[PDB]
UniProtKB/TrEMBL annotation, chain A:
PANTHER family: RUVB-RELATED REPTIN AND PONTIN. Keywords: Activator, ATP-binding, Chromatin regulator, DNA damage, DNA repair, Helicase, Hydrolase, Nucleotide-binding, Nucleus, Transcription, Transcription regulation. It is found in: Nucleus. This is RuvB-like helicase.
From TrEMBL, chains B, C, D:
Its EC number is 3.6.4.12. It catalyses: ATP + H2O = ADP + phosphate + H(+). This is RuvB-like helicase. One of its GO terms (molecular function) is DNA helicase activity. ATP binds at A16, H17, V39, G72, T73, G74, K75, T76, A77, Y328, R340, R366. The lineage of its organism: Eukaryota, Fungi, Dikarya, Ascomycota, Pezizomycotina. InterPro entries: AAA+_ATPase, P-loop_NTPase, RuvB-like, RuvB-like_C, RuvBL1/2_DNA/RNA_bd_dom, TIP49_P-loop. ADP binds at A16, H17, H19, V39, P71, G72, T73, G74, K75, T76, A77, Y328, R366. It comes from Chaetomium thermophilum (strain DSM 1495 / CBS 144.50 / IMI 039719) (Thermochaetoides thermophila). Keywords: Activator, ATP-binding, Chromatin regulator, DNA damage, DNA repair, Helicase, Hydrolase, Nucleotide-binding, Nucleus, Transcription, Transcription regulation.
């Protein structure tokens, strides 16, 4: 509650859908990817390309060069970026962003881009903190107005119950905390860390002996340090009309102390990863900011993604591949994703059903794959959630084809919804056939 | 600042949906062809049910609802049914995309105000108050008509006190002299009895609390767009409401209940609006965002002529759960017309209902439903108690529909 | 304010031009087909020589340079060669037109900052300093490790002094008591020896002086876009730099040396930018403006759809000396690839150089040059010390070029 | 502001009265010729007893005490005995009339300060404190060395708390991060144990509370007349002491105990001083004013040469209860000398006591008592442990008395 470490904030608005990805799924010596490993499935060339890119950064063969992931919608662009992010470490900052989010009436584009980059540059300090280690006995979740829960954690000598806030419950669910797990909670940061499990489950550390003070490494982004030393953003801040902008005087104060600690040796700067979805949405001014920022030594890995082949360079009257400034295209490393084969699609949806704890009948997944083929992975992944509740209403043991048929009939994908609205207002072809 | 808060609602918006009591579904989540005010639109009503179930199951993490259909396909009605199925006295805020275009108010500032109209407070209270002008002499206070075993505060005997059984709280007019002028801290003796029991029940939205505290008597200010500036509700005021609302929840007195923000003409919203809504959907406290579009393909406002589905950007469309709303059959229209007639008090012949249906077929439901009120006047003026086919035929000629109105004005060979 | 100034350069920009040592011309101004890192582009290299000669002869009164060619035709390289041929450690500032589009910084304010990066100071000094804590008793001062015939200033014996042989300049810690608190004007005794000889040699640009004096320890500020405002370098600060720089020149200590401002994507600049550059070319102190365009016909930014040569307005084009840069032959490309390989440390088979050349033929030099680094990783990971044709074939599939990348995304009958 | 207050006393004043333990009276209020340090002065000691009885009976409504006698007749001693007979640790403030004549401080402002030195606080406390960093989980707090069924305030679990059993009161260093800088509200973990029992006993005067709160470490300020201004104790500060003292009494924690203000050289006080004392005697809270005069007839200071009794104005004399103090017999003096010797540690021969008595006969007791200390030095320097008649004879010649000192200086036929 005093601070919030980089680990628990990793890809905040995009983690849930990409929860299964534990890494890039590649071998360390030969960079050859395994067909299906570390969550990722069948995007071999892109996964190998990403692996070669990550090594180039480590080796220092590229500098001030951004990563571009071009491919059709729902082809693992956001997934491979998360896979790259995971392979750098859990204590490496990872910021996700839709290029549209820069254009808001609340804050300036410069502020939005500043916060984005500040969130992806971590500050590492070794400091004393009270660490609560133990065995999970019972986790309770009951969702002021929002989630409120209880964690019953034990050591061989102590038995205690702790009330949890919305932020903690989220971090616990992010780390998938189960009754029986051996976890350590940083009391200053709120950092949940899976160490082991006291008793095996679904095919190995013993319950701790003895809350203890330890010299621990704390990685906290520049944006969080800004937030901590700024006025506390109160309850209902989103609907209060208060802009999330950070006062320059506070930023100056933090930048000087961070520069002091780096020089003194009290701190080391940990550049992470900044992911920008919908890059075709950024303007000429935005890309210039990215240029200036990429020239810095503390610059994070700027990974960005586009679904559009050719787009207009926003702010100019010129067009280009993915709508990137022609000077910017030269520096960037382009990685391409392609559509999945029906067999490649079924594995992905089956993994997402497991991450959602939904049991599909062999035939329900088959239709969920036919749906994924035509209307993409995104819409299909949303259908699992709806099918779960349509089956629950009729009290079913598993989600059947009847339920997947219902979700698809009740809820439309964009291609059918446009086709609906259009044909309902105007008839293109008359009863005789004439247009 | 205030506990006794008066709630305000824009009733003109929910006027045509006086009959919609709910979705009209069964136990297994299947819509009955004619139930709770609804006639047809079964699949869309069922899909709205799956939605109210997902909200109750807490699976609408950062998801929205998109009602895609033509004009008068019961979109605003389904949106209202969602708030009704969600529970009792749940906030429902229906707004259009064109409303956001304000000359003095910022696009997102109006969006923020309607979000506050869609977040409420359920205050269930039974205040066991003991008030009046005051271990020996344990209890003893007097009211204007009464006097009545048993924390210790900076107050002496002979002062007006107010203490509740559940929560403890804190000089009288009786001892005030005319020689003491304005140094005064004197309060009058409380009216009624010492022991008071009040059944306090309030269903007010954040906006109702803001508008009440903006007032330093207010009905005229409600019935007015008094000043061009409208600088009454401020950031500091909103924060003060939020802090005192949080205190009420922490005491377990009030329930923060998120409602339904319904945005019709969703294509009118720009990128800046959609990014405000993206940030909103992220919040757990946030209400459900239900969008509506009668547009198949529309340009993205704030984008370089990028035409997309329903004029909703890809990033925001992803989050939305698209529900299609179908047009009605002449028989289906007749039922709706009849339901509207009985709610409005008017009554017409089966033949007059038939002609109203004929207008609901060519032009939407919305236009033909407007034909009841003038025909009621036309029948009553003649000396009738029931509206006939002649009065519907007169009203259709007296009051024209937007499309028919424009075509004759152009005509003084029309195509496309 | 400061004499010991640390110079800063954006090395990422001059990274691909580590091999260009100069233009590679002879005594009579004719380019040798392969010299000083260059391969071919003889006529353009010769034309760049005529330019560096005109600057040295002082005939470039208010004239510029326009490098017209396609992508990867050695424009940025020729621009760098111009600074190298002009003399030793001459400022070279390569920027693109798109860089000028800053959200917080005014279009001409960024242009002004890069002009300061292209105007330098050559400080050749041999400071014969005699410092330490002090016609009878002519000379006598002491240092932290030493003590050592021979204007008269407001300083007494027992004070720390600093006087240079070429220019005369102006209480010690030894006599400071703890009873005297903060009324203090006490300085410590200088470390080392009394007689000091320093070989002071500085090649810093106006921008290096501004950034140093903006700092009231700074490496992090250099490795950061710390604040969104960036209000450190101000008009008053710039003026103060200019006044103290003018003093250094008037003393014959420093040389104000104008460098090369290279602006790639010249068509991106507007009328307001071009009028800033017109005013710049007028100044004698101003550096050489070298523009670059890969556009034949482009619209004048800030003009009503007036399409002109290279997107440069007529008034500014007049001033420019247009030099055309030609594409390369597959043999010419192979040489460049080989030179780049040896500079980068990588080494590949003649067959792998052949495939890289094949990509440099269809797509530009810039793309195929990017194919070396991943193939080096691909070969080393396998267990190779030399890159083969198989690794170039793998790298071309792993890392795509902008045109090829877009075409497959559109394909999910492409023409024009 | 502070509970733990350190008391300060001007001990040099009460130095010669180390032997006076009380008045030395019996049960029926009759003075024993030799008791509680006293020798003779029976009637005056008895009269002082009647006075301490009247104060205890509350009959000294607005009355004072006037001790009329010659120099060294035990006036200051009787004044001290009054405070001792009044009770345990009762404030006693002995001052002279000449003290009031301050250059920077107003005549009544010094009188006001000595009144505060004569009004105290008896704080009898047994604090049952439970402190440390924090119906389920009823009690649980930890100290630096310990941890330990069972109002509800704005404090969460993990914060440092302090709550006493008799009166309820209100973030820890353990969760404080280095990333959070100066936004800090973090307190360290309390040392010792959770359950603490303290025997709090304080006997401090209003002045001790003022001087402690004037300090924002202070012993030097006590051992100094640091600044000529001395603007530390202010009206606002005094009021703040009075308000917090009143709170301590209203809680029944402390007892406001009025002491004894002894004013020697009473004739030195003017009309303005006497009117300040008239207003003081009126107060019930006020201490007993005990005045002393060695003057028979003296002019009223602040009056037109109006000579009155003891230099006290008629209006103020009325209020006073005049007690006469008689001179002593050579035998009576010898006893006092012996008592003083045994308290001071010194010891002398009966013959040396006889000579000291001879000086106490002609000159006062005060002078001859001063003859012990130098004679002790004179005997010890010789090599004696006991003082002889020769050392008293030497000390009388070495150290002269005011009258004898002046007479020889005039002589270089003296009368009247
Ligand atoms: N190769 C893959 N392996 C596993 N899951 C994948 C893969 N590609 C996509 N997914 C999953 O499919 C869903 C949609 O794909 P996503 O990565 O978001 O698409 P996009 O290419 O449009 O960024 C997500 O839940 C994502 O994790
Ligand atoms: N299925 C239905 N059952 C009953 N009334 C309906 C139905 N569909 C529409 N209506 C009514 O028709 C009128 C206009 O329809 P409305 O809800 O405004 O649709 P839309 O929002 O698509 O224009 C309202 O009075 C509405 O309650
Ligand atoms: N004639 C040449 N000789 C040697 N290297 C060259 C030559 N032409 C281009 N290059 C190199 O090719 C790369 C890309 O060319 P560049 O100078 O950026 O051209 P442009 O500015 O026209 O895009 C650089 O590494 C550059 O030094
Ligand atoms: N009756 C007495 N018994 C004992 N000591 C006495 C007596 N009278 C005077 N003294 C002592 O003699 C000294 C001087 O007398 P003091 O009290 O100052 O008298 P005064 O105030 O009249 O000058 C003090 O040490 C005092 O205690």
């Amino acid at each position: 509650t005093s601070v919030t470490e980089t680990k628990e904030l990793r890809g905040l608005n995009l983690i849930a859908a990409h929860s299964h990805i534990r890494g890039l799924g590649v071998d360390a010596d030969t960079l050859e990817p395994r067909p299906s490993s570390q969550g990722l499935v069948g995007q071999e060339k892109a996964r190998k390309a990403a692996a070669v890119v990550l090594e180039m950064i480590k080796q220092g063969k590229i500098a001030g060069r951004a990563v571009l992931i071009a491919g059709p919608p729902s082809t693992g662009k956001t997934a491979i970026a998360m896979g790259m992010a995971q392979s750098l470490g859990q204590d490496v900052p990872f910021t996700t962003l839709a290029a549209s989010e820069i254009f808001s009436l609340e804050m300036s584009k410069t502020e939005a881009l500043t916060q984005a980059f500040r969130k992806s540059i971590g500050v590492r300090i070794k400091e004393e903190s009270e660490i609560m280690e133990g065995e999970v006995v019972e986790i309770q979740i009951d969702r002021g107005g929002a989630k409120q829960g209880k964690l019953t954690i034990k050591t061989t000598d102590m038995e205690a119950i702790y009330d949890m806030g919305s932020k903690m419950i989220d971090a616990m669910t992010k780390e998938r905390v189960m009754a029986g797990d051996i976890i350590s909670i940083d009391k200053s940061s709120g950092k949940i860390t899976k160490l082991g499990r006291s008793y095996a489950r679904s095919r190995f550390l013993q319950c701790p002996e003895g809350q203890k003070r330890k010299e621990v490494v704390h990685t906290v982004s520049l944006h969080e340090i800004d937030v901590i030393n700024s006025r506390t953003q109160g309850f209902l801040a989103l609907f209060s009309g208060d802009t999330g902008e950070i006062r320059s005087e506070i930023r100056d104060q933090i930048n000087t102390k961070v520069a002091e600690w780096k020089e003194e040796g009290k701190a080391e700067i940990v550049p992470g990863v900044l992911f920008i979805d919908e890059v075709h949405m950024l303007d000429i001014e935005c890309f210039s900011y990215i240029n200036r920022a990429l020239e810095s030594d503390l610059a994070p890995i700027v990974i960005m993604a586009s679904n559009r082949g050719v787009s207009r360079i926003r702010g100019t009257d010129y067009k280009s591949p993915h709508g990137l400034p022609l000077d910017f295209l030269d520096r960037v490393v382009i990685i391409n994703t392609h559509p999945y084969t029906p067999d490649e699609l079924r594995q992905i949806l089956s993994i997402r059903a497991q991450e959602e704890e939904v049991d599909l009948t062999p035939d329900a997944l088959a239709l969920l794959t036919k749906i994924g083929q035509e209307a993409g992975l995104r819409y299909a992944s949303n259908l699992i959630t709806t099918s779960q509740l349509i089956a629950a209403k009729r009290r079913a043991k598993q989600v059947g084809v009847e339920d997947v048929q219902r979700s698809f009939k009740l809820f439309y994908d964009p291609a059918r919804s446009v086709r609906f609205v259009q044909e309902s207002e105007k008839r293109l072809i008359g009863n005789d056939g004439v247009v | 600042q205030i506990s006794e808060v008066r709630g305000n609602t824009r009733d003109h918006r929910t006027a045509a949906h006086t009959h919609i009591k709910g979705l009209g579904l069964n136990s297994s989540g299947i819509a009955e062809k004619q139930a709770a005010g609804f006639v047809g639109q079964c699949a869309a009503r069922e899909a709205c049910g799956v939605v109210v179930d997902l909200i109750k199951a807490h699976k609408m993490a950062g998801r929205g609802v998109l009602l895609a259909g033509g004009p008068g396909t019961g979109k605003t009605a389904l949106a209202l049914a969602i708030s009704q199925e969600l529970g009792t006295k749940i906030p429902f805020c229906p707004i259009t995309g064109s409303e956001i275009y304000s000359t003095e108010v910022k696009k997102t500032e109006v969006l923020m105000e309607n979000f506050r109209r869609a977040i409420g407070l359920r205050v269930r209270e039974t205040k066991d108050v003991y008030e009046g002008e005051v271990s020996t002499l344990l209890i003893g206070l007097k009211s204007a008509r009464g006097q009545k075993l048993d924390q210790k505060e900076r107050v002496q005997v002979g002062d007006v006190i107010y203490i509740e059984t559940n929560t403890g709280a804190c000089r009288s007019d009786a001892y005030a002299t005319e020689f003491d002028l304005e140094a005064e801290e004197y309060v009058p003796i409380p009216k009624g009895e010492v022991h008071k029991k009040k059944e306090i029940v309030q269903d007010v939205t954040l906006h109702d609390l803001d508008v009440a505290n903006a007032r330093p008597d207010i009905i005229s200010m409600m019935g007015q767009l008094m000043k061009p500036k409208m600088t009454e509700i401020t950031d500091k005021l909103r924060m003060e409401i939020n802090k005192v609302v949080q205190k009420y929840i922490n005491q377990g007195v009030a329930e923060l209940i998120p409602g339904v923000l319904f945005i019709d003409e969703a294509h009118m919203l720009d990128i800046e609006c959609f990014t405000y809504l993206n940030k909103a959907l992220e919040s757990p406290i946030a209400p459900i965002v239900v969008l509506a579009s009668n547009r198949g393909i529309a340009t993205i406002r704030g984008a370089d002529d990028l035409k997309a589905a329903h004029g909703i950007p890809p990033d925001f469309l992803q989050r939305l759960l698209i529900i299609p709303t179908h047009p009605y059959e002449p028989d289906e229209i007749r039922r709706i017309v009849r339901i509207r007639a009985q709610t409005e008090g008017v009554q017409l012949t089966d033949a007059a209902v038939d002609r109203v249906a004929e207008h609901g077929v060519r032009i939407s439901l919305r236009y033909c439903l407007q034909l009841l009120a003038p025909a009621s006047i036309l029948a009553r003026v003649n000396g009738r108690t029931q509206v006939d086919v002649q009065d519907i035929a007169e009203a259709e000629e007296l009051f024209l529909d937007a499309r028919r109105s424009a075509n004759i004005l152009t005509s003084t060979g029309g195509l496309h």
